[PDB]
Amino acid sequence: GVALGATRVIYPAGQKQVQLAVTNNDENSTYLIQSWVENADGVKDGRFIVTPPLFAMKGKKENTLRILDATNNQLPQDRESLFWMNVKAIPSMDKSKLTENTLQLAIISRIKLYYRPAKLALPPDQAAEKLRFRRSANSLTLINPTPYYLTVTELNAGTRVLENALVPPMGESTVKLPSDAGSNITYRTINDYGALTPKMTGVME
Amino acid sequence: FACKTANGTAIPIGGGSANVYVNLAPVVNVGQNLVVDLSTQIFCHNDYPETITDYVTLQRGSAYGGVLSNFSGTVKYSGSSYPFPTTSETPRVVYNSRTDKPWPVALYLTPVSSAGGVAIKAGSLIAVLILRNTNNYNSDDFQFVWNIYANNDVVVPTGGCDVSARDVTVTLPDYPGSVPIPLTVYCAKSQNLGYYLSGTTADAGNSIFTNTASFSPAQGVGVQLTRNGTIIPANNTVSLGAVGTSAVSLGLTANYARTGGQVTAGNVQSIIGVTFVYQ
Ligand SMILES: CO[C@H]1O[C@H](CO)[C@@H](O)[C@H](O)[C@@H]1O
């Protein structure tokens, strides 16, 4: 089908633009590539505009998408803002299967896009450690004090495993705590390159 | 004949070896290129140019660590490229001056589909290149051994997964019928996927997709997708676990479901958007 070069995207505040790769694997089958950027609440506002807004990839191709900053510094400058980029691949209609009952699918890749204010203290590679905790016979409230979005994964209460989490900057995110816990926290995060970071042991606050 | 390193380190006549440290591009995507231009850090000169001519070659070129597992490349030696790792000694270049001129060796490395996250660890041996020297004056044959060490990590961002599927499904199975929809996903690098369907709906339960058609809209029916007997309403993310090198089938079946109370002859065609969510 059609796949994006990244699994996420980081938009550097100030950057005139940011590029993302798109490629069609199907040796023969054209597609219409529509792309847009929804915000955290999934509302298609204008904060970000992608070009080209509409185009075709006849068979194997490999074009570039350009995310354009549209929010004239109208966003939070002390931390990241979460947005969602969607790239939809529209298949052409088969003029042959006209008198037929059909169901045509349309794949869409939806990857996170983080807006990163050009000036931030704590460097990104040094944030997945600032991750503190707080437990209960129920809650295990994650708590990211940094300005970046922590994509917590492989989070285990040591004993029992757990539900992944996306802990917003300087905010928390609760997760159920199914008894089998003890205190041995073991989690891993997904970095700017969509790669897992090293295991780590939960440090309660 | 002698050579010195940009950092100043030298290997006198007779040869020997030295470390050549490099700062490689921090990020390189699959299909993209990693170039280590050594013609910037290795210089050699001819000692008695007026009467002696020097012939310099790329005797061997070996890969190590990251580069050896995460890359496939060529060695461009003086306007010509050859395989890297090298399999044969290259043509000779001449050095005829006491002034340090460059050694035109450059690596063109390309991360593979399977390249990890840190395709090259910082401080690791990236390559060892052997510079050979001879001359038209005597029978001397000396080897200069350059050890290429990477100063930083070379990261190859993980790409999106691939949704293999057989085009436009023929839900022909006359009104009552129901076909299975082939659809799998294979990620070059294991990661957790999540997907949800989107499209216009026709029921309170948001699971029967409206009939979009040109010829006689067989009013009354609609298309509902199920994954192993389980209904998939629109916008209800389904955790696919973690897709890896083995394409997981979503296990979908296009089913006819009724909307209003008056099923009626005609064609039933539908358009559904499947959205894969990345972590
Ligand atoms: C003494 O000769 C040295 O210098 C000449 C001129 O560079 C080289 O050709 C030769 O191989 C030796 O390195």
Side-chain angles (χ1 to χ4, degrees):
Chain A
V2 177
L4 307 181
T7 49
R8 87 239 304 93
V9 162
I10 300 309
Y11 211 99
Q15 271 297 301
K16 203 185 304 300
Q17 64 157 52
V18 171
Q19 316 191 168
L20 177 69
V22 175
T23 141
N24 176 34
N25 304 25
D26 306 354
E27 257 170 53
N28 48 191
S29 66
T30 296
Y31 289 96
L32 262 158
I33 307 305
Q34 279 188 342
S35 2
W36 64 102
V37 173
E38 300 174 30
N39 68 353
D41 298 307
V43 318
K44 304 199 188 61
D45 39 49
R47 270 78 191 62
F48 292 78
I49 286 168
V50 187
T51 60
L54 174 80
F55 65 95
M57 292 175 81
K58 303 172 69 177
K60 290 183 161 69
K61 294 291 298 168
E62 200 304 82
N63 324 97
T64 309
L65 288 189
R66 289 114 190 304
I67 294 80
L68 303 193
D69 182 349
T71 175
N72 276 187
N73 273 63
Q74 300 176 189
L75 270 176
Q77 293 299 175
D78 76 330
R79 72 197 84 189
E80 282 176 346
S81 296
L82 160 63
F83 288 55
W84 296 91
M85 195 179 145
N86 306 70
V87 178
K88 147 184 282 189
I90 313 189
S92 292
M93 188 237 248
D94 182 352
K95 293 91 171 182
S96 68
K97 306 252 164 302
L98 232 266
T99 58
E100 299 176 55
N101 277 349
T102 85
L103 171 70
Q104 230 181 204
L105 290 186
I107 287 59
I108 300 160
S109 308
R110 149 168 290 227
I111 68 193
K112 321 193 204 164
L113 164 55
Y114 298 104
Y115 179 75
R116 194 169 297 168
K119 289 171 190 178
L120 295 170
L122 205 105
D125 53 327
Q126 181 195 162
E129 61 163 43
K130 318 284 174 179
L131 183 54
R132 284 189 287 183
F133 299 74
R134 166 193 294 167
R135 36 170 49 275
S136 289
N138 40 68
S139 293
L140 197 187
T141 322
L142 295 258
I143 167 172
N144 167 25
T146 77
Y148 312 70
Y149 265 86
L150 308 188
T151 292
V152 171
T153 171
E154 288 203 8
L155 181 76
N156 325 288
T159 321
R160 200 73 169 60
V161 67
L162 287 174
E163 207 58 298
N164 288 305
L166 174 51
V167 194
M170 313 189 251
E172 320 177 318
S173 303
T174 63
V175 185
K176 295 67 237 296
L177 203 48
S179 296
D180 319 354
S183 169
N184 192 51
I185 295 317
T186 331
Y187 75 93
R188 303 176 64 60
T189 66
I190 296 180
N191 72 54
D192 284 351
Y193 309 112
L196 276 140
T197 71
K199 287 194 170 185
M200 285 168 83
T201 306
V203 177
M204 290 57 80
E205 51 175 0
Chain B
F1 177 94
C3 309
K4 87 181 304 83
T5 235
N7 283 293
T9 289
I11 299 183
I13 39 195
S17 63
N19 284 359
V20 175
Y21 312 86
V22 300
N23 311 294
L24 311 146
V27 181
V28 175
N29 293 291
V30 185
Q32 199 165 71
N33 259 176
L34 191 58
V35 189
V36 209
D37 199 17
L38 289 157
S39 64
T40 312
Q41 306 212 291
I42 301 178
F43 303 82
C44 301
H45 68 256
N46 188 308
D47 279 316
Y48 304 105
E50 295 72 51
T51 42
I52 307 188
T53 294
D54 268 320
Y55 307 113
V56 176
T57 65
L58 177 61
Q59 228 286 45
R60 199 179 330 294
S62 303
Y64 292 79
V67 167
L68 189 54
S69 66
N70 303 319
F71 299 71
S72 163
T74 60
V75 62
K76 187 190 182 179
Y77 186 52
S78 192
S80 313
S81 282
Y82 316 67
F84 181 71
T86 67
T87 25
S88 83
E89 197 183 329
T90 60
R92 48 183 192 55
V93 174
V94 297
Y95 282 75
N96 53 191
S97 158
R98 300 192 170 69
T99 302
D100 294 304
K101 147 191 168 183
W103 187 41
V105 180
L107 265 21
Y108 287 114
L109 305 184
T110 319
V112 289
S113 191
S114 60
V118 173
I120 282 194
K121 259 119 226 314
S124 64
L125 186 74
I126 299 300
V128 175
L129 307 176
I130 302 172
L131 177 165
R132 194 168 197 152
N133 151 281
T134 41
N135 61 298
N136 67 198
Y137 175 64
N138 67 194
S139 39
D140 292 351
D141 174 276
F142 305 126
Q143 299 209 302
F144 288 68
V145 167
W146 311 92
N147 304 313
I148 285 57
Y149 279 77
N151 279 323
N152 51 289
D153 285 309
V154 161
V155 150
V156 171
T158 157
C161 310
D162 179 34
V163 176
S164 301
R166 307 174 192 166
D167 203 6
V168 49
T169 301
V170 207
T171 172
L172 180 162
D174 298 56
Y175 166 50
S178 84
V179 296
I181 301 171
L183 208 170
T184 41
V185 285
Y186 70 82
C187 303
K189 303 287 285 167
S190 166
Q191 50 169 301
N192 301 317
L193 277 185
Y195 80 105
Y196 70 70
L197 312 167
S198 49
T200 320
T201 256
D203 64 304
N206 200 200
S207 51
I208 313 167
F209 294 94
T210 310
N211 194 175
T212 289
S214 187
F215 193 42
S216 177
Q219 180 187 179
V221 199
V223 185
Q224 173 165 277
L225 312 195
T226 173
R227 53 175 207 274
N228 286 294
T230 297
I231 298 185
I232 313 182
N235 317 115
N236 183 65
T237 319
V238 171
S239 303
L240 245 189
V243 186
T245 76
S246 302
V248 182
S249 180
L250 312 188
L252 313 167
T253 306
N255 306 199
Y256 287 91
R258 295 168 55 187
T259 50
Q262 183 55 190
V263 184
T264 299
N267 296 202
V268 172
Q269 274 166 46
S270 200
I271 43 176
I272 305 311
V274 200
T275 302
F276 289 77
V277 197
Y278 295 71
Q279 188 185 197

